Amino acid sequence: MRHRKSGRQLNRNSSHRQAMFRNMAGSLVRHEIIKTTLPKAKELRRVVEPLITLAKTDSVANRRLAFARTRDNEIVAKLFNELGPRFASRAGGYTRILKCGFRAGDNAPMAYIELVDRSE
Amino acid sequence: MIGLVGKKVGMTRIFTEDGVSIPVTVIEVEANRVTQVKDLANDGYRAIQVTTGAKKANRVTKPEAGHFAKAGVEAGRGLWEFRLAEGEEFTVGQSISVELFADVKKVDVTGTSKGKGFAGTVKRWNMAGQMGNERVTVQSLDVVRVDAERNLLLVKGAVPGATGSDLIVKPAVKA
RNA sequence: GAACUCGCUGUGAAGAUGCAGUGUACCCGCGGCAAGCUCAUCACAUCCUGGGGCUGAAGUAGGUCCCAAGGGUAUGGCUGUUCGCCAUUUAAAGUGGUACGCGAGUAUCUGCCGUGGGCGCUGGAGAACUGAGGGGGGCUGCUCCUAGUACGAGAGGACCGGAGUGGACGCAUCACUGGUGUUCGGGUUGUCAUGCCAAUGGCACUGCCCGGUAGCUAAAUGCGGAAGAGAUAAGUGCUGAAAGCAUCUAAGCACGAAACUUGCCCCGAGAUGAGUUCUCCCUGACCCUUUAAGGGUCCUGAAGGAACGUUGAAGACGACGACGUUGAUAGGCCGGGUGUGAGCUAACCGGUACUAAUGAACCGUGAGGCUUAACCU
RNA sequence: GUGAAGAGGGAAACAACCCAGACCGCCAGCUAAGGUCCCAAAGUCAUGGUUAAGUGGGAAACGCGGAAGAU
RNA sequence: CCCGGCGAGGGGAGUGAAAAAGAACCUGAAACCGUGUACGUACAAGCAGUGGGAGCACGCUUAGGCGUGUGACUGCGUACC
């Protein structure tokens, strides 16, 4: 405990935290850029990078797993077709995070997460 | 007489020579270069402080670089003191390995423990403090494997050292 | 009512933070422990571990006295019970003070532990240590050549304490025994959803179960209570008068308890008595005054440190360690292994700059004050 | 007699013990009780001894012992 | 006129004797909260004051040792009803 542990706790319900991660990943991939707090931003990057890495291999099983973890027909349809070839040369680090100060409402740090290519 | 400083590679139950799985510690033996030797006149006592490992120059600042240049050896993980046997004196620059340690079978081991956070009173006393991460003085250990080719020192039982933590082994006199 | 709100001893319309004596403590904070059945502390006026005298002490085993608090000094059946009665152990389940000690067991405050900010150690910074001083513990059953041997009339029956073998406890690690390991995999009931089957996902405690990566765990084992040394009380004494003897003492002049210290280790130079070793750096100018460890202005911003960026087997916050484009510090990818069941693989290991770790900025100096002594001038 | 309704000085503080009744001020001296190795001020004074026990510096009655006490 | 948010508020100019009279509007002390001034304090124990007191800045008799502000320290000192 408190030593050699991967993934910040973010005290919440397990199913609730999984659903929030799925929704946040879907929103970010749809919008190509999101504004999220750094503690959640790091978890977002850690949980989203595996999906884009797996998107490189196009197969029925891979598409089924992507839909299972995403539950959005449009997101799966656009995946395996555009992000894959765009970052074919790149191996890892498909996204970047830049800090944007803090939220005035509740002094909450915020950060922009966006694809490294970001366009084209 | 002379001690060594290294790290805990691992701790597993290895088969004995007879063929029985016995707990044994895996301790690497790194060549500890002699950096400075104390004298009873200049400083009041005689003892040798040595260094182990090799750290990049970025971490070491230039005053420490000059100190090591005085020592005549490259900067390493740090400096560890060792009491001299009050007899023969070593030379600055040379390094030593397990070598003669296979002649006592009573060598002592010193080191830290698991990284454990400040625990609650109930779980630690059943009054808030820390357990572990303290120097350990377990003694009366017996050496098992003294293979110097692998630069690994193995002793009977377990070793007081966390994964990747520094530790020392000395030719104890107690039992 | 106001506080610049320490401990012990003595007095006290009687447990004194405010009285007399005595000891300790750099100033200011954060998180806990609640003293004002759990938790303990102290004296011996001693239950044992015991060692020494006497013994109606042949040896074990004992009876009485002298020393010893270093350590321990139970579990059950009756009371609310202290106490007390019965069963089984052990070395014992010891006697007393603390209002049989302990019922604040918005704590404002004092008291104890972990951890920080300011400053001092006299030019600054970096580490490495001597180290006074405080703390952890001196636990224990059995066997073996010694040994049915010396001593002892026979019988009885050693100094031995050298070796191994269990137990209560702390320290240490998950590799063997497994548990946990809702972040890994598989089976599956009801309902909803993907145009529909198959196939997938949410809710029903992770819907309910079968295993389990890394880490943590005791039910697992590794070390252990030294030996030795100094000093010892009682006791035991080699030789020996005053007092033609004796005598532990008057002369010469020793051994000696498990009781004290050291011997092993933790913290520790805030030890203000502020310690020692080494290394790197600062080697400008000008002005004024009440005339000196004086002040002020321009330039300089060195060594070193820290706030940010990646972070950790360090962490409540602080704080410590590593990396920071002169790169494996974190994330991801490949490979290997485990798990699950040809696939997924979180946390296990090697490689990879593919991404994040920048350029920069801030604090920090301009030779270090005075007095005495030895060295070349 | 004290306090009640007298301060002050000595005894470690101590309301009950001892000296001693403050008009005020003054950087003078002399004394009461009590002390003159200091803290804390004064002789480490002088004469002849007891005490060798830290009794002094806490302990009766009883026959030098009695003596064990304030963590 | 300007800052400010096209507000509130404030600052210049002017009126106004006076704006240290501005619509919270005569004069505006204390309790309570700040800044600067001069001094002390980070090895020192208790009704926090009393006499002594070197130093630290200023004006003075232009020193001649005077006071103002303070007290490192010293002996003493156990709130009121």
Author numbering:
A (entry chain N): 1 to 120
B (entry chain D): 1 to 126, 161 to 209
Give the article text.
One state (d126_(L29)-/(L22)-) represents an early assembly precursor prior to the formation of the subunit’s core. To elucidate the underlying molecular defects leading to the accumulation of precursor particles, the most immature states from the Api137 data set (d126_(L29)-/(L22)- & C_(L22)-) and the control data set (C_L2) were compared. While the d126_(L29)-/(L22)- precursor exhibits structured domains I, II, and VI, it lacks cryo-EM density for domain III of the 23S rRNA. Formation of domain III coincides with the presence of uL29 and uL23, as observed in a previous study. Furthermore, domain II helix H34, which serves as the foundation for positioning domain IV helices H64 to H67 during subsequent assembly, was consistently docked in all but two precursors (states d126_(L29)-/(L22)- & C_(L29)-/(L22)-). The absence of helix H34 was observed only in precursors that also lacked uL29 and bL23, indicating that these proteins are necessary for the proper formation of these critical regions in domains II and IV regions. Additional misorientation of domain IV regions was observed in nearly half of these cases, resulting in an overall frequency of 18.1% for the ~H61 states. In contrast, the absence of uL29 was observed only in the earliest precursor states, representing 5.1% of all precursors.
